[PDB]
Scaffold this active site. Structure first.
Site, PDB file in Angstrom:
ATOM      1  N   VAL A  18      33.321  86.142  14.476  1.00 21.76           N
ATOM      2  CA  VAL A  18      32.623  84.914  14.179  1.00 21.76           C
ATOM      3  C   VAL A  18      31.387  84.959  13.340  1.00 21.76           C
ATOM      4  CG1 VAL A  18      33.810  83.805  16.113  1.00 21.76           C
ATOM      5  CG2 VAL A  18      31.353  84.199  16.173  1.00 21.76           C
TER       6      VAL A  18
ATOM      7  N   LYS B 296      31.687  75.404  11.262  1.00 22.56           N
ATOM      8  CA  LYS B 296      32.764  74.540  11.616  1.00 22.56           C
ATOM      9  C   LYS B 296      32.751  74.263  13.102  1.00 22.56           C
ATOM     10  CE  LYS B 296      34.337  76.603   8.002  1.00 22.56           C
ATOM     11  NZ  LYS B 296      34.774  76.739   6.615  1.00 22.56           N
TER      12      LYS B 296
ATOM     13  N   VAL C 132      62.790  74.008   5.939  1.00 19.63           N
ATOM     14  CA  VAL C 132      64.113  74.337   5.508  1.00 19.63           C
ATOM     15  C   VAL C 132      64.415  75.843   5.685  1.00 19.63           C
ATOM     16  CG1 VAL C 132      65.596  74.275   3.480  1.00 19.63           C
ATOM     17  CG2 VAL C 132      64.079  72.334   4.160  1.00 19.63           C
TER      18      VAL C 132
ATOM     19  N   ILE D  78      63.280  78.427   3.270  1.00 18.05           N
ATOM     20  CA  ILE D  78      62.145  78.040   2.470  1.00 18.05           C
ATOM     21  C   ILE D  78      60.979  78.468   3.236  1.00 18.05           C
ATOM     22  CG2 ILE D  78      60.702  76.266   1.530  1.00 18.05           C
ATOM     23  CD1 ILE D  78      63.099  74.671   0.742  1.00 18.05           C
TER      24      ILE D  78
ATOM     25  N   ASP E  70      68.640  79.095  19.093  1.00 15.41           N
ATOM     26  CA  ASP E  70      69.821  79.654  18.379  1.00 15.41           C
ATOM     27  C   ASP E  70      70.426  80.760  19.165  1.00 15.41           C
ATOM     28  OD1 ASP E  70      67.817  81.561  18.026  1.00 15.41           O
ATOM     29  OD2 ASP E  70      67.988  81.497  15.748  1.00 15.41           O
TER      30      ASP E  70
ATOM     31  N   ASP F 296      73.024  84.711  15.172  1.00 17.12           N
ATOM     32  CA  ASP F 296      72.711  86.096  14.802  1.00 17.12           C
ATOM     33  C   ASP F 296      73.363  87.071  15.748  1.00 17.12           C
ATOM     34  OD1 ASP F 296      71.074  84.963  12.865  1.00 17.12           O
ATOM     35  OD2 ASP F 296      69.170  85.608  13.873  1.00 17.12           O
TER      36      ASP F 296
HETATM   37 NA    NA Z   1      61.832  77.413   6.451  1.00 15.44          NA
HETATM   38 NA    NA Z   2      28.918  88.548  15.662  1.00 15.69          NA
END
Ligand code: NA
Ligand code: NA
Length: 327
Positions: free
Chosen positions: A57, A64, A95, A98, A182, A248
DNA sequence: CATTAGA
DNA sequence: TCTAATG
């Protein structure tokens, strides 16, 4: 686990972003470690400064953390969540075939959507063609009731081809699970082990059987040991056909099966946990073997296994039903 | 963490 | 060969 929940999610989010959209591995690893450490920290982070005390950190993350601490949100987070380009990527990416790279390349060309994708099938390679083609089926879970139907199918061909084959459907499926992502079939044969220099037809025969009866309808990636494709239960006496599923099938050196099957059977926690145990019990476990641990630091020598039991006995534990391999 | 595709 | 992608 919840006391730091947001800081962690924002963080993962943030992180995820540099990784896909931008190509910023660094920053990107930056977020995850940070994410990693704060997740542990035993207390509610009340400020950036406090967070900052942690390792991983930096100043950038503390900042942030403040904004998110102060206002229930973060600008940059807001900005990204919005931005179309970035949204397009996280999307294309769904996909099969992808990923970040092709996703940005597509976008930078204008393909931002599923339609675009279709209009441009020619710009897609067979894996992706299929990913696209079954995009819907690919996101749909696998009812266990369906898995049992499938498995019932595979075991039957495997056997009919060669009685010697040994197959195991791994995963959550195996761990009793209600639905599944799957199907993972772990495969093996006596005549194939660590040395006995392959037998590629060994894999190929089944793949071919499976297709011959239409359980497999497509091939994503077929190699001499791992076959990655698509299967489908027969659409009965019509009115209802079954969605296309990812499967698979992988060849295993009969001499490493159970380490294999032990492993893929998970869960991710049960693994490490079992894994963490062998160490005390003077061992080492990994995807294929189990070696006795030598005090010099390390040590080799693959003990011989004939069932998930051996592995247990070895490290001397309770045989845990897969059902209970939960953690 | 390793296997396959692709170009 | 490198590089991407799924696991
Ligand atoms: Na993909
Ligand atoms: Na630190």
């Amino acid at each position: 686990e919840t006391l730091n929940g947001g800081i962690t999610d924002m963080l993962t989010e943030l992180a995820n972003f540099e990784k896909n959209v931008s190509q910023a591995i660094h920053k990107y690893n930056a977020y995850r470690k940070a994410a990693s450490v704060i997740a542990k920290y035993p207390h509610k982070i009340k400020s950036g400064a406090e967070a900052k005390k942690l390792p991983g950190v930096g100043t950038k993350i503390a900042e942030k953390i403040d904004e998110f601490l102060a206002t229930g949100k973060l600008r940059k987070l807001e900005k990204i969540r919005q931005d179309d380009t970035s949204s397009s990527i996280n999307f294309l990416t769904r996909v099969s075939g992808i990923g970040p790279s092709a996703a940005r390349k597509f976008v930078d060309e204008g393909i931002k959507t599923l339609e675009d994708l279709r209009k441009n099938e020619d710009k897609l390679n067979h894996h992706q063609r299929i990913g696209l083609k079954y995009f819907g089926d690919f996101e749909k879970r696998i009812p266990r009731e369906e898995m049992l139907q499938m498995q019932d199918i595979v075991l039957n061909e495997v056997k009919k081809v060669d009685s010697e084959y040994i197959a195991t459907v791994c995963g959550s499926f195996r761990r009793g699970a209600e639905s599944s992502g799957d199907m993972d079939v772990l495969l093996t044969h006596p005549s194939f082990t660590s040395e006995s220099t392959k037998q590629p037809k060994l894999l190929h025969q089944v793949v071919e059987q499976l297709q011959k009866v239409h359980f497999i309808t497509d091939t994503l990636s077929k190699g001499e040991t791992k076959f990655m494709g698509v299967c489908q239960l027969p659409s009965k006496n019509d009115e209802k056909e079954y969605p296309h599923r990812r499967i698979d099938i992988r060849l295993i050196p009969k001499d490493q099966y159970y380490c294999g099957v032990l492993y893929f059977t998970g869960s991710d926690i049960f693994n490490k946990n079992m894994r963490a145990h062998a160490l005390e019990k003077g061992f080492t476990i990994n995807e294929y073997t189990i070696r006795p641990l030598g005090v010099t630091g390390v040590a080799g020598e693959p003990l011989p296994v004939d069932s998930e039991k051996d592995i247990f006995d070895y490290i001397q534990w309770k045989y845990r039903e897969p059902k209970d391999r939960s953690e």
